[PDB]
Design a protein around this motif. Structure first.
Motif, mmCIF file in Angstrom:
data_model
loop_
_atom_site.group_PDB
_atom_site.id
_atom_site.type_symbol
_atom_site.label_atom_id
_atom_site.label_comp_id
_atom_site.label_asym_id
_atom_site.label_seq_id
_atom_site.Cartn_x
_atom_site.Cartn_y
_atom_site.Cartn_z
ATOM 1 N N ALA A 20 -59.138 -23.851 4.562
ATOM 2 C CA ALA A 20 -57.958 -23.823 3.700
ATOM 3 C C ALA A 20 -57.998 -22.613 2.761
ATOM 4 O O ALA A 20 -56.967 -22.125 2.335
ATOM 5 N N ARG A 21 -59.186 -22.155 2.390
ATOM 6 C CA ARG A 21 -59.276 -21.009 1.482
ATOM 7 C C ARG A 21 -58.676 -19.724 2.076
ATOM 8 O O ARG A 21 -57.962 -19.001 1.386
ATOM 9 N N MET A 22 -58.904 -19.449 3.360
ATOM 10 C CA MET A 22 -58.303 -18.283 3.979
ATOM 11 C C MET A 22 -56.768 -18.391 3.989
ATOM 12 O O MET A 22 -56.073 -17.413 3.678
ATOM 13 N N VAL A 23 -56.249 -19.571 4.314
ATOM 14 C CA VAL A 23 -54.804 -19.784 4.274
ATOM 15 C C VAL A 23 -54.294 -19.519 2.850
ATOM 16 O O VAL A 23 -53.306 -18.806 2.664
ATOM 17 N N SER A 24 -54.958 -20.091 1.857
ATOM 18 C CA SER A 24 -54.607 -19.882 0.463
ATOM 19 C C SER A 24 -54.629 -18.418 0.055
ATOM 20 O O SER A 24 -53.709 -17.937 -0.612
ATOM 21 N N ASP A 25 -55.701 -17.707 0.423
ATOM 22 C CA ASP A 25 -55.833 -16.316 0.073
ATOM 23 C C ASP A 25 -54.717 -15.492 0.726
ATOM 24 O O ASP A 25 -54.124 -14.618 0.071
ATOM 25 N N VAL A 26 -54.409 -15.738 2.000
ATOM 26 C CA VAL A 26 -53.320 -14.995 2.651
ATOM 27 C C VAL A 26 -51.962 -15.240 1.956
ATOM 28 O O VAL A 26 -51.246 -14.308 1.596
ATOM 29 N N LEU A 27 -51.628 -16.492 1.720
ATOM 30 C CA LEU A 27 -50.382 -16.781 1.020
ATOM 31 C C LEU A 27 -50.366 -16.141 -0.358
ATOM 32 O O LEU A 27 -49.322 -15.666 -0.836
ATOM 33 N N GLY A 28 -51.504 -16.189 -1.048
ATOM 34 C CA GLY A 28 -51.579 -15.646 -2.406
ATOM 35 C C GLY A 28 -51.401 -14.132 -2.481
ATOM 36 O O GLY A 28 -50.771 -13.601 -3.423
ATOM 37 N N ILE A 29 -51.977 -13.434 -1.509
ATOM 38 C CA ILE A 29 -51.822 -11.982 -1.409
ATOM 39 C C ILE A 29 -50.369 -11.624 -1.088
ATOM 40 O O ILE A 29 -49.792 -10.708 -1.712
ATOM 41 N N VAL A 30 -49.769 -12.314 -0.128
ATOM 42 C CA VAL A 30 -48.378 -12.059 0.220
ATOM 43 C C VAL A 30 -47.486 -12.359 -0.996
ATOM 44 O O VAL A 30 -46.602 -11.548 -1.347
ATOM 45 N N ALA A 31 -47.725 -13.488 -1.660
ATOM 46 C CA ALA A 31 -46.911 -13.835 -2.812
ATOM 47 C C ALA A 31 -47.021 -12.764 -3.872
ATOM 48 O O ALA A 31 -46.007 -12.375 -4.476
ATOM 49 N N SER A 32 -48.242 -12.305 -4.130
ATOM 50 C CA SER A 32 -48.491 -11.316 -5.182
ATOM 51 C C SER A 32 -47.843 -9.973 -4.835
ATOM 52 O O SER A 32 -47.290 -9.291 -5.720
ATOM 53 N N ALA A 33 -47.905 -9.596 -3.558
ATOM 54 C CA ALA A 33 -47.277 -8.341 -3.123
ATOM 55 C C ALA A 33 -45.754 -8.386 -3.311
ATOM 56 O O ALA A 33 -45.128 -7.422 -3.785
ATOM 57 N N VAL A 34 -45.148 -9.484 -2.885
ATOM 58 C CA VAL A 34 -43.711 -9.657 -3.040
ATOM 59 C C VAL A 34 -43.346 -9.631 -4.524
ATOM 60 O O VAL A 34 -42.341 -9.027 -4.946
ATOM 61 N N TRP A 35 -44.153 -10.314 -5.319
ATOM 62 C CA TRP A 35 -43.949 -10.339 -6.749
ATOM 63 C C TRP A 35 -43.995 -8.933 -7.384
ATOM 64 O O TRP A 35 -43.097 -8.571 -8.147
ATOM 65 N N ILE A 36 -45.010 -8.134 -7.050
ATOM 66 C CA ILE A 36 -45.091 -6.772 -7.516
ATOM 67 C C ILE A 36 -43.841 -6.007 -7.170
ATOM 68 O O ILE A 36 -43.264 -5.317 -8.037
ATOM 69 N N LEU A 37 -43.377 -6.132 -5.930
ATOM 70 C CA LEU A 37 -42.182 -5.393 -5.513
ATOM 71 C C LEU A 37 -40.952 -5.816 -6.330
ATOM 72 O O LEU A 37 -40.156 -4.989 -6.824
ATOM 73 N N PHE A 38 -40.791 -7.125 -6.489
ATOM 74 C CA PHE A 38 -39.622 -7.630 -7.190
ATOM 75 C C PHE A 38 -39.669 -7.316 -8.678
ATOM 76 O O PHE A 38 -38.645 -7.040 -9.295
ATOM 77 N N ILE A 39 -40.846 -7.341 -9.266
ATOM 78 C CA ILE A 39 -40.991 -6.962 -10.670
ATOM 79 C C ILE A 39 -40.615 -5.486 -10.861
ATOM 80 O O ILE A 39 -39.900 -5.126 -11.808
ATOM 81 N N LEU A 40 -41.086 -4.633 -9.957
ATOM 82 C CA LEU A 40 -40.767 -3.214 -10.058
ATOM 83 C C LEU A 40 -39.258 -3.030 -9.884
ATOM 84 O O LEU A 40 -38.616 -2.199 -10.569
ATOM 85 N N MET A 41 -38.658 -3.784 -8.972
ATOM 86 C CA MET A 41 -37.196 -3.709 -8.796
ATOM 87 C C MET A 41 -36.449 -4.149 -10.041
ATOM 88 O O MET A 41 -35.452 -3.543 -10.437
ATOM 89 N N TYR A 42 -36.896 -5.220 -10.656
ATOM 90 C CA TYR A 42 -36.237 -5.715 -11.843
ATOM 91 C C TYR A 42 -36.419 -4.735 -13.015
ATOM 92 O O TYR A 42 -35.518 -4.547 -13.810
ATOM 93 N N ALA A 43 -37.578 -4.091 -13.092
ATOM 94 C CA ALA A 43 -37.787 -3.031 -14.070
ATOM 95 C C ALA A 43 -36.797 -1.889 -13.874
ATOM 96 O O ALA A 43 -36.237 -1.383 -14.847
ATOM 97 N N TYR A 44 -36.530 -1.547 -12.624
ATOM 98 C CA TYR A 44 -35.519 -0.540 -12.283
ATOM 99 C C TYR A 44 -34.128 -1.024 -12.714
ATOM 100 O O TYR A 44 -33.320 -0.248 -13.244
ATOM 101 N N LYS A 45 -33.835 -2.299 -12.490
ATOM 102 C CA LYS A 45 -32.560 -2.873 -12.925
ATOM 103 C C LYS A 45 -32.390 -2.774 -14.438
ATOM 104 O O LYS A 45 -31.297 -2.433 -14.954
#
Ligand code: BOG
Ligand code: BOG
Ligand code: BOG
Ligand code: BOG
Ligand code: BOG
Ligand code: BOG
Ligand code: BOG
Ligand code: BOG
Ligand code: BOG
Ligand code: BOG
Ligand code: BOG
Ligand code: BOG
Lengths: 307, 307, 307
Positions: free
Chosen positions: C31-56
């Motif tokens: 379960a830890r590998m599944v968790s880590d993969v989801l967490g990395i993807v979530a964090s990457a998407v979050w970084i992108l969206f935060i940078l977009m909102y900063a641009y907004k």
């Protein structure tokens, strides 16, 4: 009539604050003198206002009748039995017999009052959407919490829990429609000081709860404090709007919540839960009630207190 | 059709009252005969009404369709699975197999009913402000509490808590808008007997709770009783208005709350909490259901029961 | 601006789901590998969206101003500090220092946001009956629960309970008027995907609660799950109506509730309470979030993601 019924908030706030300081006497002995002074002042003011209201009943009865039948103004009458019980709670330290008489008079009185008037509203056609005011908490919520804690003081813990439950569920059942109404309808300036009553429920609730449960700061108590502080922060942000048309004596509406922040803070501190927050809450609430007292003395000096 | 769906309140009240007396058998052995008599009568009435409703479904289906789609009248259909479960609870003392079948049928039935109809209301445009009636508690609240206690009887305590929570939170979530509506809009006489359902939530709630928690009279139970008694006092004061247009069979709407006052009283008494209040509650509720039974026999003798 | 603020539901759901899988690592190490993969993807998407909102904020500020002052659209801004805290919670497994900074930024940010905007609504005249939307739960309820669980992760359990109480009571206080509004007013198709937020409160609530109370599955937790499942069943029945006008990216509104079903399921399972239901809930919620991910990839491939 020279005394607006809402002025009973004054002995309410002072009395509740006396009780808060009473609870610090074993931590800091000098707290007892502060408590006793506040309690004597509260009781004196209460005696004066009770005698005035007795005069109103005897000689200005149609004014009482109109306030009683109003679906908005009736609520302030509940301050009378609430303060009767709080003065009983003060006096218990000196004379438990007289205290017990006042506590039962206030308990029977508030329960009869709500049973007669609050229920009558359910017949419809009198209360209107615009009647949805914070003052409704007084007969509905604050009076039951005050009975709860007062009966616990007398040793009636299980009876106290009945009153506590009546107040707590009544609160949760009214607040949803109040906040929706406030969101949609701008409360007019003449009523805005009553926004201070919105501070009361969670803090009065937890104070009453801790009075009945032997001061155990548990999950329920912490949950209540959290919502209480949320509401405080909201009201702090709203304060300039609240006082848009100027500072007024109606701001004593805040004192039930402020004094109950102080009282509950003493129990959190005693329980070693969030002591820093507790100290903040206790100091903040004392300072704000202190400001209320200073503005009141000012108004009395300028002849702008009584109607 | 000769049987109004609301008449299922009759076996409801009798069945719940049977269960209350069952709970006193170890304190007072003669209580078992009283319980058994009430339970047999409740079950007989239930059989008759179920067979009648089956006839309605087969031969008067458009009447069922209309009541089902009504945003007000649909609620009374929930009495059918509620009473099915209560009769199962009675029968458990004699035949746990048949009891378990009835309890599951009533549980699946009520959950399917609410899932289909209660949710559908959220599509909007059908339910109106004037649809905000006490009867909504039946599918929303009473049915879940009945599943909770019935599943606990069968040993499914954790599943029972799920149903209990669904009912308790559903109650707290509906009541605020109900009481506001009653305050503003005068409920017409033809619906006023349904004010009796307002007595139900807190008492049904605590009765179900005590059924799942091994009868431990704790802080939650006391809190519920307190609000329950508040509502009782309000409804007692309102009773002349409730029956403005005369006594009627709709007053059996009070029986869920009354029978649950009786049941919860037995548990408070067993727990040595507020025994005096418990005795009052038990006697009061039995007397009132007794009066319901006497008025019903009267109506049957005069040919004024069935439509 | 190409990114609708509601798209922050995407990293929200993925992040919360990562945390759910994290909680199964000691039962099932993979379960830890599944968790880590989801967490990395979530964090990457979050970084992108935060940078977009900063641009907004920098280049499209009047769009931000309008959404902020809207009594409906303001709520989605709360997704920003909510997801900031959830990403902090993920990152705690690798770097508690950076995690703690994000958790405090998100906590201070959400509390300041609600204190400024949610309270302002109480001035009246801006929020209208038609503004009564599920999205109001985000600043009011979800943000406080997220602070509660995040602060508990950092060891601040009593502070966490304050936030928990603020969220729980805020929920109970808003939901009554929301459900009444939905009953009366048909929510237009363009907003219907936000019905998914109705799934959130009970599941987010119990997940946050179990995060603070050391995972003890107690009576409160079971009560919350029961109402949570009631709401799930209602939303399942309503799903065809929800998607009347087609499947859309707004359906990520369901992910807070779904991910919290998964998270709470792990704690119920760990506690040996309703393990079968727990397995169902965990599988169901993962499958539904999986479908959300597949529909999202589809939309991205067809160039129908960004505005
Ligand atoms: C401190 C509380 C003050 C109570 C004010 C009571 C108002 C009652 O008022 C009156 O009572 C009569 C019956 O006694 C009715 O006939 C009157 O019409 C009704 O107005
Ligand atoms: C606050 C302390 C106790 C309150 C006493 C209130 C007594 C009110 O008085 C009552 O008012 C009624 C209307 O609701 C009248 O119908 C009644 O006849 C009268 O008993
Ligand atoms: C309207 C909000 C009501 C929330 C009630 C909180 C439920 C009480 O919470 C309970 O507190 C007990 C004492 O700390 C604990 O022993 C229990 O584990 C916990 O469930
Ligand atoms: C409701 C809270 C009021 C309590 C006031 C407490 C003020 C005391 O202050 C405290 O005194 C302690 C020893 O007495 C010191 O250890 C603490 O650091 C100090 O904060
Ligand atoms: C005890 C509960 C009685 C249930 C009454 C059911 C009413 C359903 O009614 C009907 O169902 C059909 C589909 O089956 C629809 O096509 C009809 O239009 C709808 O009215
Ligand atoms: C009370 C015991 C069980 C209740 C059975 C109710 C079955 C209702 O029947 C249903 O009515 C729907 C509308 O809401 C129709 O759309 C459905 O097609 C039909 O399944
Ligand atoms: C809507 C009203 C909900 C009120 C829930 C009351 C919270 C439960 O109260 C809890 O009861 C437990 C058992 O007696 C005690 O051990 C806990 O100290 C107490 O917090
Ligand atoms: C739900 C409450 C119903 C319980 C009925 C109890 C009636 C018994 O009555 C009680 O009997 C006791 C001994 O049995 C006596 O000690 C008590 O004083 C007496 O009140
Ligand atoms: C992520 C949250 C975005 C915040 C948007 C802020 C909108 C504030 O907006 C503006 O603030 C000014 C004061 O600073 C006022 O003078 C403006 O009239 C008011 O619109
Ligand atoms: C979501 C993360 C933090 C939110 C920051 C919001 C800041 C809003 O900015 C504020 O908007 C107000 C109106 O309500 C203006 O009156 C204020 O002058 C301004 O401070
Ligand atoms: C809005 C719904 C709030 C319901 C709060 C439920 C009250 C908490 O329930 C409490 O749980 C404790 C731990 O399991 C038990 O020890 C107590 O006996 C029980 O009263
Ligand atoms: C949130 C719930 C996710 C937990 C997934 C559990 C899946 C394991 O499945 C379980 O394995 C047990 C031994 O490990 C077997 O005894 C059980 O019968 C089986 O159901």
């Amino acid at each position: 009539f020279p005394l607006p019924t809402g002025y009973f908030d004054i002995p309410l706030g002072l009395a509740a604050l006396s009780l808060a300081w009473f609870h610090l006497e074993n931590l800091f002995p000098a707290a007892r003198m502060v408590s006793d002074v506040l309690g004597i002042v509260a009781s004196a003011v209460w005696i004066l206002f009770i005698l005035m209201y007795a005069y109103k009943l005897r000689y200005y009865f149609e004014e009482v009748r109109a306030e009683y039948h109003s679906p908005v103004r009736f609520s302030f009458i509940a301050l009378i039995p609430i303060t009767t019980m709080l003065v009983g709670d003060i006096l218990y330290r000196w004379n438990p017999l007289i205290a017990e008489v006042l506590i039962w008079i206030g308990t029977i009185g508030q329960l009869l009052f709500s049973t007669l008037r609050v229920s009558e509203l359910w017949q419809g056609g009198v209360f209107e959407q615009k009647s949805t005011h914070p003052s409704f908490y007084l007969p509905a919520v604050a009076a039951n919490f005050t009975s709860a804690s007062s009966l616990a003081l007398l040793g009636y813990h299980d009876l106290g829990y009945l009153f506590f439950g009546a107040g707590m569920i009544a609160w949760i059942i009214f607040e949803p429609v109040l906040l929706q109404h406030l969101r949609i309808s701008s409360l007019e300036p003449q009523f805005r000081a009553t926004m201070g009553i919105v501070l009361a429920p969670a803090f009065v609730c937890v104070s009453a709860y801790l009075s009945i449960n032997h001061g155990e700061v548990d999950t329920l108590a912490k949950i209540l404090w959290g919502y209480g502080f949320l509401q405080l922060f909201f009201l702090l942000r709203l304060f300039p709007w609240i006082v848009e048309k100027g500072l007024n004596i109606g701001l004593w509406a805040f004192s039930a919540g402020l004094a109950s922040m102080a009282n509950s803070a003493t129990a959190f501190y005693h329980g070693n839960v969030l002591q820093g927050v507790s100290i903040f809450a206790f100091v903040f609430s004392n300072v704000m009630i202190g400001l209320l007292v200073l503005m009141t003395i000012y108004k009395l000096t300028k002849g702008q207190f009584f109607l």
